[PDB]
Amino acid sequence: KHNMKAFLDELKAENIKKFLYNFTQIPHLAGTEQNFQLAKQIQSQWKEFGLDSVELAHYDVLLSYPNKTHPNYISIINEDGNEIFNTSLFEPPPPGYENVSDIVPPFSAFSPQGMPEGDLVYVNYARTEDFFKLERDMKINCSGKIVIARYGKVFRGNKVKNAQLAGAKGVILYSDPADYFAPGVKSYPDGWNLPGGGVQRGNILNLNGAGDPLTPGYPANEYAYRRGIAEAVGLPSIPVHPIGYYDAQKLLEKMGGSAPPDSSWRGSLKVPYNVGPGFTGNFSTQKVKMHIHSTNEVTRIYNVIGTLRGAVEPDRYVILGGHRDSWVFGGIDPQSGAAVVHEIVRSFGTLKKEGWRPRRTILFASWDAEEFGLLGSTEWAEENSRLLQERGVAYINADSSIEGNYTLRVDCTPLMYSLVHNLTKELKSPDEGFEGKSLYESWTKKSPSPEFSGMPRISKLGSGNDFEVFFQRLGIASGRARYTKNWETNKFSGYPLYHSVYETYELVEKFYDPMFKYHLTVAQVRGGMVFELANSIVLPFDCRDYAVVLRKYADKIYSISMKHPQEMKTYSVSFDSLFSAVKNFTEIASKFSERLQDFSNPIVLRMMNDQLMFLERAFIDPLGLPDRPFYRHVIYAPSSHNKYAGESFPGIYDALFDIESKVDPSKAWGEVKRQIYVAAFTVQAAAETLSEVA
Amino acid sequence: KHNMKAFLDELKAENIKKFLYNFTQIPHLAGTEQNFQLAKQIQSQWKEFGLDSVELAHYDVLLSYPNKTHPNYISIINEDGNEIFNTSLFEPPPPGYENVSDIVPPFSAFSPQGMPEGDLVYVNYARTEDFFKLERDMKINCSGKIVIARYGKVFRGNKVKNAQLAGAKGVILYSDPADYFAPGVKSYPDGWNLPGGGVQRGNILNLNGAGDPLTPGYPANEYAYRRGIAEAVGLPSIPVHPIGYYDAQKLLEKMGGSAPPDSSWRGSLKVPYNVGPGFTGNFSTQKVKMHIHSTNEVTRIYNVIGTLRGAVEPDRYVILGGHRDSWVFGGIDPQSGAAVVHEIVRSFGTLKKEGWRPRRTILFASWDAEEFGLLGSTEWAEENSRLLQERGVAYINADSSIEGNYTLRVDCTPLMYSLVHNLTKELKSPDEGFEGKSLYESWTKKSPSPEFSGMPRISKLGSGNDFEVFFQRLGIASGRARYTKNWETNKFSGYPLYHSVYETYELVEKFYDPMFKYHLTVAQVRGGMVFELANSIVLPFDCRDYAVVLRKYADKIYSISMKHPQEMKTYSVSFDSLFSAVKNFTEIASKFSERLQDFSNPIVLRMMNDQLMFLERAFIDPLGLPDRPFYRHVIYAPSSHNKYAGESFPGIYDALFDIESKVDPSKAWGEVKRQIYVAAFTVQAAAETLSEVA
Ligand SMILES: *[C@@H]1O[C@H](CO)[C@@H](O[C@@H]2O[C@H](CO)[C@@H](O[C@@H]3O[C@H](CO[C@H]4O[C@H](CO)[C@@H](O)[C@H](O)[C@@H]4O)[C@@H](O)[C@H](O[C@H]4O[C@H](CO)[C@@H](O)[C@H](O)[C@@H]4O)[C@@H]3O)[C@H](O)[C@H]2NC(C)=O)[C@H](O)[C@H]1NC(C)=O
Ligand SMILES: *[C@@H]1O[C@H](CO)[C@@H](O[C@@H]2O[C@H](CO)[C@@H](O[C@@H]3O[C@H](CO[C@H]4O[C@H](CO)[C@@H](O)[C@H](O)[C@@H]4O)[C@@H](O)[C@H](O[C@H]4O[C@H](CO)[C@@H](O)[C@H](O)[C@@H]4O)[C@@H]3O)[C@H](O)[C@H]2NC(C)=O)[C@H](O)[C@H]1NC(C)=O
Ligand SMILES: *[C@@H]1O[C@H](CO[C@@H]2O[C@@H](C)[C@@H](O)[C@@H](O)[C@@H]2O)[C@@H](O[C@@H]2O[C@H](CO)[C@@H](O[C@@H]3O[C@H](CO)[C@@H](O)[C@H](O)[C@@H]3O)[C@H](O)[C@H]2NC(C)=O)[C@H](O)[C@H]1NC(C)=O
Ligand SMILES: *[C@@H]1O[C@H](CO[C@@H]2O[C@@H](C)[C@@H](O)[C@@H](O)[C@@H]2O)[C@@H](O[C@@H]2O[C@H](CO)[C@@H](O[C@@H]3O[C@H](CO)[C@@H](O)[C@H](O)[C@@H]3O)[C@H](O)[C@H]2NC(C)=O)[C@H](O)[C@H]1NC(C)=O
Ligand SMILES: COC(=O)CCN1CCCc2cc(-c3ccc(/C=C(\C#N)C(=O)NCCCC[C@H](NC(=O)N[C@@H](CCC(=O)O)C(=O)O)C(=O)O)s3)ccc21
Ligand SMILES: COC(=O)CCN1CCCc2cc(-c3ccc(/C=C(\C#N)C(=O)NCCCC[C@H](NC(=O)N[C@@H](CCC(=O)O)C(=O)O)C(=O)O)s3)ccc21
Ligand SMILES: *[C@@H]1O[C@H](CO)[C@@H](O[C@@H]2O[C@H](CO)[C@@H](O[C@@H]3O[C@H](CO)[C@@H](O)[C@H](O)[C@@H]3O)[C@H](O)[C@H]2NC(C)=O)[C@H](O)[C@H]1NC(C)=O
Ligand SMILES: *[C@@H]1O[C@H](CO)[C@@H](O[C@@H]2O[C@H](CO)[C@@H](O[C@@H]3O[C@H](CO)[C@@H](O)[C@H](O)[C@@H]3O)[C@H](O)[C@H]2NC(C)=O)[C@H](O)[C@H]1NC(C)=O
Ligand SMILES: *[C@@H]1O[C@H](CO)[C@@H](O[C@@H]2O[C@H](CO)[C@@H](O[C@@H]3O[C@H](CO)[C@@H](O)[C@H](O)[C@@H]3O)[C@H](O)[C@H]2NC(C)=O)[C@H](O)[C@H]1NC(C)=O
Ligand SMILES: *[C@@H]1O[C@H](CO)[C@@H](O[C@@H]2O[C@H](CO)[C@@H](O[C@@H]3O[C@H](CO)[C@@H](O)[C@H](O)[C@@H]3O)[C@H](O)[C@H]2NC(C)=O)[C@H](O)[C@H]1NC(C)=O
Ligand SMILES: *[C@@H]1O[C@H](CO)[C@@H](O[C@@H]2O[C@H](CO)[C@@H](O)[C@H](O)[C@H]2NC(C)=O)[C@H](O)[C@H]1NC(C)=O
Ligand SMILES: *[C@@H]1O[C@H](CO)[C@@H](O[C@@H]2O[C@H](CO)[C@@H](O)[C@H](O)[C@H]2NC(C)=O)[C@H](O)[C@H]1NC(C)=O
Ligand SMILES: *[C@@H]1O[C@H](CO)[C@@H](O)[C@H](O)[C@H]1NC(C)=O
Ligand SMILES: *[C@@H]1O[C@H](CO)[C@@H](O)[C@H](O)[C@H]1NC(C)=O
Ligand SMILES: *[C@@H]1O[C@H](CO)[C@@H](O)[C@H](O)[C@H]1NC(C)=O
Ligand SMILES: *[C@@H]1O[C@H](CO)[C@@H](O)[C@H](O)[C@H]1NC(C)=O
Ligand SMILES: [Ca+2]
Ligand SMILES: [Ca+2]
Ligand SMILES: [Cl-]
Ligand SMILES: [Cl-]
Ligand code: NA
Ligand code: NA
Ligand code: NA
Ligand code: NA
Ligand SMILES: [Zn+2]
Ligand SMILES: [Zn+2]
Ligand SMILES: [Zn+2]
Ligand SMILES: [Zn+2]
């Protein structure tokens, strides 16, 4: 029989391992010839595997590269202008890769050029609250200072935006062992920790969903009109560069001025973590100087798009997508994901060769330039936005399959919760101690839901990956899944070797997943979701699960506002309309679910499959959120303080944030009330898409 | 049999006449008790007629009314401040209505209050080109002047916006006999001409699609957050008032300063039409003073929404809508339309009582507050926008059924051209001399297409009526049809008694349509279109007709740009991408049409009906046109110089308009190129919705 079990049994750990090895021998930086060569290889293999069509979709987008003959670095300079300390020009390459060429040195993509010199201020993680603490409580002024911030806790683009708004003239990012060195594990190559010469690459844009900085709204095709650089979306205005902790120690050790305000500001290095500004007495005349010479350049990128045409509803698309470009070798990010997609394609293609087709069309995507701002997925969705919003059933992302070896991690729309619970109950746990038990059982035991006993934790989608255009701009039901760590060590930093030259095939094979069993489990979860989405007669979405979370989010946002009881009285701020809408959604969703159970009529079916498919769509507001026109989903947006985190009822959340500091409270509370109305209206409108249609 | 012929034969001229009489005995001003009473009557009768559900949908919107105890008027004042001439306080009521109460006196809805005094400037029709002529050629400065403009040629809101941007401190509108008195016909009540005491009411907003000025984007429901008045959409900033030609003659006769620049500036009154400023020598110390005391007030309005549930595709909506509110009695506008809708509902309901249902759902709408800015249709579409954009097949408007008795007028999307040709070939001409001939034949003979022999003229949709939200904001295929005049007399002014107290039942019964045969023909055209849209197995849209017009519009816009060959060379302005997209659309549309002919499979059918339904939808750009976020259709928008007229490729048109006067040509031509890219991209994206789906 050709059923989900046939699909799942065809997936092989050994194949994933072979593909990962194949994808990680050389760097595949976006816009480079090697990444175009890999794109062509994937296109050819997906054709071989049996897909109906496999095309490259190319765009010309703004990318950023260091200057090969004018290297980026940072110095401590003395009063004569002699550079007495220089940060490294490259990470020491790992064993056996010391002759690999075209390893891009560490840099912050899209940094402007410049050579600013000044006194250092240490700003902890450079979060909104770190700058609050500096300016409001400690009275330290960052204006015209170079700030030094540790990576972790929030997306590095938000750190840079925060530093810029504080008046910094430059930003130095570094990896503190507190955040990137797990106690009792060795540094690469003898364990999975970050060595002191290791450095995390990454872009520092604030795109807010825009895609290519030069063509917001429209695909960067051959005849596109581009903005000039001065009007580009999301570029930083001050130079930025990342360093490892050997070099950071040299920059931090001489720091003077004020003490750290508390122990939450101290990392693990043998330094005081003084905030500054500037160095202690002996060295007070020394300064820090950055030298940044990277250039932004419009460069061609290539997505591979594979199609497996649906037998019954070819005009309904279930999308499995993940990126292919990497900073260096991409051992985890993204090739551990891409190897998993390759094996999924292979398995579906085996079934297709035996005569099977899925009910709905499955689209497979190998995205380019994800690392430079989700550019390949966003440009392709801008090109195809009309097809996607009228036909897009679901998008399953497929970046890194592992960031640990402890348990499953799922972030998705509430519409997929029941699908994920059901599927994981049918899959075998790969975990030691759970032999013969379901993935659901092991996952639930290791990662319990905070709300419900006997259920596992499933998080809201945030951002910083290729589902952003599909979910928060276009309103297509989206999900992601990977193996993860126990979050009770170095929390809200990912894995230590993230975006470093040390993220290699050997990292994975030796330290994360030697048997490729976690990879296989992740292929079963991602592939299984795609299979059910593309093949179930009734779409496997439960609208009642949206009703339950909407109430939780409404309680949360109400609780935030209720910290200001006097202002809620003065300005007549009521949440009644939002609770009413959520109550109505709950009642209508319950009734819709009864009809979905209680209806041989393919029009009623497809009518109801359309109501299911368009339910995520109904949370889109075509006017977008304030000053973020590409974040249109009213229930979920990336946190305005951390692109990685999701925020619920983001319009109301941002209206309430730090509201006690606004100069005009009547105007600020007016805007809170405006966002309440928008959210209540959108919830009610979404509910009404589930009512009887006539 | 229950087929279109059964539907059409059930329609009766005598019923339309009875309904028109019933709807026009008292005024039905939006927001008044009498208009709520009529709404309740229509709701009750549509239920009686057999519709499945009939609901009122109410909103609280900004309306505008004169102050009953502080009347609006204009004076000529002398140097002592004695008011030596006053304009009328009311139109002399027609025979037999001299005791009807609650006739709203003439006023310009949404005028601010004020009592400005100053010298008059006569500005012809107050068009963009009239102000160009004044400022650029004649060197007359309107700053701080009261302008007097004749009605006609363009929507009165554009006149006011143009006067405001010229620095006027007030606007006086009047009806010139040149534009509102047809040679050789008598004034009401003895003919259909405007008497000298007659005055045209009408709002002077510039909403650009926004709907209620206080709630752009969202329905004005019970919990809506409203903008303050200062941030409202579209309100004029200077007082405005309309007068008849007896009073205008008194204001114009003393005008001095410069002569009219040419005869296109002279109307029919026995006055010089001097432009001013101010009066001739003897009277140079006299001034004009306005007294405006109207108030804007949030007021409840009521739409009636009737549903006839579809038998096979209940989740597909074909909408017949027209408004019910009137300025006074609404003898033509809108009750000649509403009586026609009432009879259509009656006929469909007769068939329903015999057991028939249409294939798709038909929604019937009696809109409120159309006269105050399309408010009722727009608020309802804002409320239901998600249902309408995923389910809306078509919208047929149904305002005034007659504006003349000469021939048919149709303005619609190209997607309806073939439907209209086919239907009119099956209908009988009501015209004298065409007994036994088709409506198509009489219409084609009297109103030939300018492009094609043996075809009738069908115009682009403009605006100034309730289809605006459905077509230009939401991208639902839309059309309108009515009987019209021969446009070779007083051109681009409508009918003489438009928006006057004289627009009565007797006007229609005595002078326009004594046998109600033109009304019946219009009921057959509107009703027949609805019938085919709601009942044809394959949607009756021909995508090839869009391809033909796209080429015509691309040639037109290219020809405008080619007036500036030097700048097109300097700035590398090419239309190649737009022509390529139009060529592709033509090829893909031809192939789609072959498949539509060449496919028992209801999924392929409905898949292809979805491609047809979503084709108009594909011309929407969710970012809207520049500074007009609610005009989202890239092919059609209301002219930025005249809301009544449609403009094709409006983004490029506005970028090219008066471009030779821009101070920064590189920036201006850059924006032309940007709009070319947007238009070429949107045409190609629309074409690709017609490609094979996978
Ligand atoms: C959750 O779902 C419920 C439906 O079960 C919605 O309930 C509606 O709530 C609104 C209030 O926001 C009600 O609005 C009121 O309507 C009255 C007229 O209603 C009649 O006509 C409608 C046709 O639209 C019928 O549906 C209805 O059954 C009645 O026949 C108005 O008279 C009310 O206005 C008066 O009172 C208010 C409040 O004091 C004053 O401000 C006004 O000035 C005026 O005096 C009022 O507008 C509506 O009737 C309810 N519908 C139903 C079917 O019960 C909730 O709105 C929904 N939640 C959200 C967030 O949408
Ligand atoms: C009307 O419809 C036609 C399709 O019939 C479209 O034609 C496309 O036109 C674009 C130009 O805008 C072509 O783009 C060119 O693609 C080359 C690579 O194409 C290969 O890969 C694609 C996969 O996407 C295949 O479809 C294709 O068959 C080929 O296998 C590039 O190499 C070209 O770039 C080079 O030349 C340009 C121009 O000189 C330089 O600026 C570049 O720097 C570079 O050197 C170029 O990008 C595209 O190939 C065409 N497709 C097909 C199938 O023919 C029209 O675009 C469409 N009109 C509109 C408005 O959309
Ligand atoms: C830190 O690095 C700086 C800069 O060095 C340069 O850039 C780096 C990224 C590497 O690619 C280096 O190889 C590269 O040189 C060092 O300061 C520089 O020192 C050099 C050599 O001593 C100076 O060159 C001199 O140039 C003048 C020309 O007028 C001659 O008089 C001299 O004979 C000599 O050739 C150079 O001027 C100087 N540059 C700057 C910007 O200060 C620095 O020594 C190094 N510090 C360390 C390792 O502690
Ligand atoms: C044009 O109309 C103005 C204003 O008249 C008023 O408003 C109109 C819309 C109508 O509703 C009128 O019925 C209404 O009166 C006329 O000017 C006004 O004339 C009256 C009567 O002569 C003046 O009243 C005077 O008030 C003072 C109070 O201090 C006394 O000294 C007088 O005994 C007398 O009662 C009024 O002040 C004056 N108003 C203004 C604003 O000028 C005007 O006569 C008329 N012109 C015509 C018909 O040619
Ligand atoms: C209900 O739910 C809840 O309770 C919500 C809970 N909740 C609410 C409150 C606190 C909170 C915090 C977080 C996080 C904070 C830090 C996080 C992780 C990192 C940091 N700093 C990090 O760098 N990880 C590396 C892998 C991830 C990026 C990685 N992606 C990329 O590398 N992409 C590129 C390009 C991206 C782009 O340009 O946009 C890049 O980032 O450079 C991946 O996705 O694997 S996640 C998440 C949820 C959360
Ligand atoms: C291919 O095509 C082509 O060739 C396109 C050709 N083409 C291109 C170039 C020249 C041109 C000019 C025109 C016109 C110019 C003036 C016109 C008519 C009037 C004036 N002035 C007028 O007042 N008519 C009264 C009835 C119409 C309004 C009447 N509507 C209302 O009364 N509505 C209210 C509220 C509206 C709102 O608030 O928005 C109001 O207007 O007050 C109706 O629709 O019956 S139409 C049309 C097309 C055209
Ligand atoms: C990753 O795996 C791919 C797919 O197996 C490898 O690419 C493939 O490499 C082989 C051997 O080089 C190619 O076959 C050769 O073809 C040429 C003619 O073009 C011929 O001269 C040789 O004799 C040989 O038959 C094959 O085309 C190619 N397939 C692709 C790109 O689809 C790739 O080498 C692996 N990469 C690494 C780093 O291991
Ligand atoms: C995840 O799995 C659960 C458990 O199987 C699914 O819920 C179950 O769905 C079935 C099929 O629709 C329900 O069966 C129905 O039962 C009623 C009788 O009460 C009958 O009227 C229907 O004809 C039908 O037989 C079943 O009740 C229901 N079980 C529970 C506990 O809710 C669920 O649908 C799955 N989720 C997804 C997204 O697939
Ligand atoms: C326009 O036509 C409508 C519909 O025919 C007229 O309204 C209807 O008027 C009649 C007579 O007044 C109403 O019947 C009456 O009902 C009351 C009880 O409510 C009773 O006291 C009387 O004896 C009589 O039976 C009828 O309800 C009403 N129908 C509606 C509103 O649906 C209306 O009068 C006409 N208007 C004009 C201006 O001619
Ligand atoms: C308006 O009326 C015209 C004329 O009736 C309609 O065009 C006609 O549509 C029919 C039905 O699809 C076409 O018949 C087809 O003919 C081909 C053979 O060439 C065959 O392959 C198909 O199975 C089918 O029998 C017919 O060719 C076509 N006539 C013309 C002159 O184009 C048109 O569809 C109507 N428009 C609307 C919107 O309904
Ligand atoms: C990368 O840096 C080098 C310099 O280290 C740049 O080459 C110089 O560019 C300047 C300014 O245009 C010229 O005046 C010199 O003649 C060049 N010098 C040398 C030594 O080649 C180069 O332009 C930069 N590359 C990029 C892509 O920006
Ligand atoms: C319409 O106009 C009348 C005046 O002709 C207004 O009534 C006056 O309002 C003023 C200012 O608020 C009061 O001081 C007076 O006591 C009122 N005078 C009279 C004679 O009644 C009235 O407010 C206006 N109506 C509206 C709805 O604006
Ligand atoms: C910080 O320093 C700058 C530059 O000297 C100054 O202009 C600014 O006002 C200061 N801000 C605060 C909050 O002290
Ligand atoms: C793999 O699992 C073991 C057992 O818990 C753990 O000690 C080790 O740290 C894990 N490896 C990684 C990379 O997390
Ligand atoms: C018109 O008059 C005003 C007011 O006196 C003046 O400020 C303005 O500059 C003048 N404009 C032109 C174009 O002459
Ligand atoms: C009705 O038609 C006749 C015949 O052409 C014409 O003379 C008369 O003016 C028409 N009435 C109206 C209101 O146009
Ligand atoms: Ca873009
Ligand atoms: Ca509104
Ligand atoms: Cl992922
Ligand atoms: Cl109409
Ligand atoms: Na384990
Ligand atoms: Na290695
Ligand atoms: Na005639
Ligand atoms: Na009359
Ligand atoms: Zn990644
Ligand atoms: Zn990454
Ligand atoms: Zn009207
Ligand atoms: Zn009107």
Numbering used by the authors:
A (entry chain A), B (entry chain A): 55 to 653, 656 to 750
Which text from the study accompanies this structure?
To provide mechanistic rationale for the fluorescent enhancement of Glu-490 upon rhPSMA binding, we solved the crystal structure of the rhPSMA/Glu-490 complex and refined it to the 1.73 Å resolution limit. The active-site-bound Glu-490 was fitted into well-defined interpretable Fo-Fc electron density peaks in the final stages of the refinement. Positioning of the Lys-Urea-Glu motif is virtually indistinguishable from rhPSMA/urea ligand complexes reported previously. The FMR moiety consists of a distal N-substituted tetrahydroquinoline donor group, a thiophene ring spacer and a nitrile acceptor group. In our structure, the three subgroups adopt a near-planar configuration that is sustained via intermolecular interactions with PSMA residues. That spatial arrangement prevents the intramolecular twisting motion of the subgroups relative to each other and such rigidity is critical for efficient fluorescence emission upon FMR photoexcitation. The nitrile group is inserted into a deep pocket delineated the main chains of G206–F209 and the Y700 side chain. Furthermore, the FMR ring system is propped against the PSMA surface delineated by residues N698–G702 of the “glutarate sensor”. Here, the most conspicuous are CH–π interactions between the thiophene ring and the Y700 methylene group (4.0 Å) and the tetrahydroquinoline moiety and the A701 side chain methyl group (3.8 Å and 4.1 Å).
Prostate-specific membrane antigen (PSMA) is a type II transmembrane glycoprotein specifically overexpressed in most PCa with limited expression in normal tissue. It is regarded as a high-value biomarker for PCa and has received worldwide attention for PCa diagnosis and treatment. Fluorescent molecular rotors (FMRs) are a family of fluorophores sensitive to local microenvironment (e.g., polarity and viscosity). In this study, we aimed at the design of activatable probes by linking a benzonitrile fluorescent rotor to the Lys-Urea-Glu scaffold, a well-established PSMA-targeting moiety used clinically for PCa imaging and radiotherapy.
